[PDB]
Amino acid sequence: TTIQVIGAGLPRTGTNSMKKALEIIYSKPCYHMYEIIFKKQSDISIWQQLIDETHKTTSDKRKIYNGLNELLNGYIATTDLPSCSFYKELMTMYPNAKVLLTIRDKYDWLYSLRKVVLPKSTDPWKLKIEEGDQVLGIDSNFYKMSEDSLKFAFQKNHINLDDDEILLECYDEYNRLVQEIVPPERLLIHHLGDGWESLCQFLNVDIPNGISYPCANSHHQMTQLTEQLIKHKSLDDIIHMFPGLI
Ligand SMILES: Nc1ncnc2c1ncn2[C@@H]1O[C@H](COP(=O)(O)O)[C@@H](OP(=O)(O)O)[C@H]1O
Ligand SMILES: CC(C)NC[C@@H]1CCc2cc(CO)c([N+](=O)[O-])cc2N1
Known part of the structure; x- marks a missing residue:
């Protein structure tokens, strides 16, 4: 198995649905943040090391390529953070892989991002996310890797992540740059709600x-999951309330 599809879309653009859609098409696994959180938390430190490598004055690109290839062994595709921030490296490693850009209205995206992935440092909901994440064993190292991978996607070191105006413009710039970099015949832009037709034509399947x-x-669903994790303190005791998600 090798990577056939590279998902460059940012978190909260329908990447989990695209994950599930690609697993339906290919009958093989697709990477996603859910894989890290719910199946392979040991991948967190590996991703952190690859992101740190990019910060170096002279980054070891072959170390990055091998780290990505090892992380993605057994997967037919990848979506979501942190992998989407490495879409250029993945395009180089897998020259025959096609690229997907899942996209949506920028204001809906920002709202979704603030409720799940990147709340403001002063938002009381951040403490609920953290208490619920503790039930899953997710600690501060996860938030650092997630935040660092987002800054890497946005190609900025010092950025005020609490400024909605800045995030909105990083969103548009990121999506614009994907369309600039990826050749059109190799890219499919999939807007939320687009469904099978364009995706299956792009991938040469029915x-x-x-x-x-x-x-x-x-x-x-994520808000409900957070509150049930806090209320019952066990994922197994609550998993039945979230069918077909994890
Ligand atoms: N087939 C579909 N149609 C419309 N929205 C979808 C969808 N699949 C996923 N989404 C939306 O995409 C977001 C999740 O994306 P991701 O998996 O990348 O985190 C959620 O947005 P909301 O948070 O606004 O509900 C989810 O509702
Ligand atoms: C239940 C909740 C309290 N925590 C678990 C959720 C699961 C979905 C999710 C998705 C992403 C990106 O897809 C990130 N992310 O990038 O940090 C964090 C989380 N966290």
Whole structure:
């Protein structure tokens, strides 16, 4: 197995649904942050080391390529942070892999990002996220890797992540740069709600008969998950309330 599809879209742009859609198309696993959080938390330190490598005056690109290849062994595709920030490196490693850019209205994205991925440092909800994440064993090292991977996608070192205006413009700039870098024939821009048709044509497959395009990972569902993790202090005791998600 080798990487066939590189998902360059940012978190909260429908990447979990695209993960599920690609697993339906190929019948093989697709990487996502959920893989890190719920299956392979040991990958957190590996990703951190690759992000740190990019900060060096002279980064070891072959160390990065091998780290990515090792991380993605057994996967047919990748989506979401932190992998999306490495889409250029992945394009080089997998010259035959096609690129997806999942995209959505920027104001809806920012709202979703603030409720799940990157709340403001003064937002009381941040403490609820953290208490719920402790049930999952997620600690401060995860937040550092996640934040660092987002800054790396935005190609900025010193950035005020609490400024909505700055995030909105980083969002647009990131999406614009993907379209500039990736050749058109190699890129599909998939807007939220687009469904199977464009995706399956791009990938040279038929539309899955009788199987609807996935619709998963809403911020309402993540808020409910946080509150149930805090209330019951166990993922196993609550997993039945979130069918088909993890
Ligand atoms: N088929 C679909 N149609 C419309 N929205 C979808 C969708 N699949 C996922 N989404 C939305 O995409 C966001 C999750 O993306 P990701 O998996 O990258 O984190 C959620 O937005 P909201 O948080 O606004 O509900 C989710 O509702
Ligand atoms: C339940 C909650 C309290 N924590 C678990 C959630 C699971 C979804 C999720 C997705 C991303 C990016 O897809 C990030 N991220 O980039 O940090 C964090 C989280 N966290």
